């Protein structure tokens, strides 16, 4: 009836436009109940320490520790040299260097050749 909205990576699909939430099953209801139970258990565990009058300091969060560890220390032990890894490493670690080397070498060779011929307009060029 109306023009259709299509989602993208940086502009996602709205919940009210999602087909999965319009055709539901008792299995889906059970899964939602389990999700809410997990969230409620975590919320109770946090709130018990949050309201503790004898608690002074920082309530340690295992999820934050897991996130930082995964982002920092768990990366190399889970690395394998593969065609994708090797190709991406070679590209993004070597290509820019040679690209910039070619650019700068060409520019400086042109400038040097111009200077040898004596046509660069270096008047008032005292500081370098």
């Amino acid at each position: 009836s109306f023009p259709k909205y299509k989602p993208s990576r940086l502009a996602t699909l709205p919940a009210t436009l999602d087909p999965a939430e319009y055709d539901i099953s008792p299995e889906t209801r059970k899964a939602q109940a389990e999700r809410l139970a997990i969230r409620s258990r975590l919320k109770r565990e946090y709130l018990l320490q949050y309201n503790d009058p004898n608690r002074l300091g920082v309530i340690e969060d295992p999820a934050l520790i897991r996130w930082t560890y995964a982002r920092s220390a768990n990366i190399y032990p889970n690395f394998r040299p593969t065609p994708k890894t090797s190709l991406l490493g070679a590209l993004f670690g070597i290509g820019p260097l040679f690209f910039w080397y070619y650019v700068f070498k060409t520019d400086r060779d042109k400038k040097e050749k111009l200077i040898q011929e004596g046509k660069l307009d270096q008047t008032f060029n005292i500081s370098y």
């Binding site: 920082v58 934050l64 996130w67 260097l97 370098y128």
Partner: protein, 458 residues
Amino acid sequence: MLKIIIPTTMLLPMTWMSKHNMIWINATVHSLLISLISLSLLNQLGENSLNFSLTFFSDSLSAPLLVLTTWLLPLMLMASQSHLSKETTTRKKLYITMLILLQLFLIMTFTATELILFYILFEATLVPTLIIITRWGNQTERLNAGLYFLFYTLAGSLPLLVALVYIQNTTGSLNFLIIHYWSHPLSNSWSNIFMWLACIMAFMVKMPLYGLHLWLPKAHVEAPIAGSMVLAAVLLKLGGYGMMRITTILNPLTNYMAYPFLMLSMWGMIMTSSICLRQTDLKSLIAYSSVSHMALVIVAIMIQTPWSFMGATALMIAHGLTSSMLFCLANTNYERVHSRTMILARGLQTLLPLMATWWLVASLTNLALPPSINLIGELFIITASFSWSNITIILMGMNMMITALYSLYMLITTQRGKYTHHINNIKPSFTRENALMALHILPLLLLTLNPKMILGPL
């Protein structure tokens, strides 16, 4: 210049003979007095250096570095006494002894007239740093950090030693004045290329050069606060000082041996600035900042112009002060919350306003707000690079955009937003911490008032 060396050697037994509850007071007072004495080295000439004796001399390049070292010792002492309160008296005295020995080695390194004596002292600085890191670091990674700190250095410096002795068999001297006056060009041969690499790689790994920098995040994150202060502020500048000394014998080979290092420095400056944008640990962000600024310094030294040398000197001094201040600022929060994760403690401006002002000023100097000496050095280097090639303004320009971003990012993450609800142990700032921040920041602006003192011999 024994009038500076002997008082530090006297700091040693003064610390070891002090009463158990007066070590910090005595060490701080006499360290400040030694800094005041070393202030007299800033009276430099326009033609040559201050040649004190056959062994020691002072230039317009090494005098600000000596002043920075002697000024950094009392700040390190002030920053260390908080987390060392539970320590035994003997171990506290040993820690202070390590700091004093490091200062002595640095002072003698910056003024040695011969290159082998310079090499010996510049390697001798390794032992106290490694001991401090591996004995008084907090986490288990410190051990690995120590190893990364050691071998990365030595794998660079062992070839240099060989080259040095080889040079002394060829020219008959390693005295820097003789080396400068009797300079001869380097021809284009494979032997000369490898001599150039042997003379350059140790200082390159000290800066550090991008690709050879992996030791630095580990060592500067795992170290105690004084270790991080002295690693960022002074020990990184050994590479730059040594490179500016050693380049007098490498011409005209440098004219084309600098290309890989220039490309590495510029692209890796962009890369480390980008890395700072996605960092979960606050100390690692400051370490990668140091890497970017040192890449700028490497470019300045490699292009070999008077403007680039002046910019390099100014940038080294400014970065030393700024990075030490940033490490201390991060350490205050770490001591409060016992975690280095940046997003753990937020909205700290609401709880600690004056510390938030210190954070703002430190981050403003990091992004080189004019007319700070950070900006003066950065602008001189950028102008020299523009003369070297007009296209460099692209990469340098990109760097200027990224730096500010991550700098402000850091501030916005820690000071703004809302405070974390469950963190209830954030006590008001102590007088010691505020005094530490002030003693970092005031010399920066005072130096802005008179910039020719940090612009070097050029």
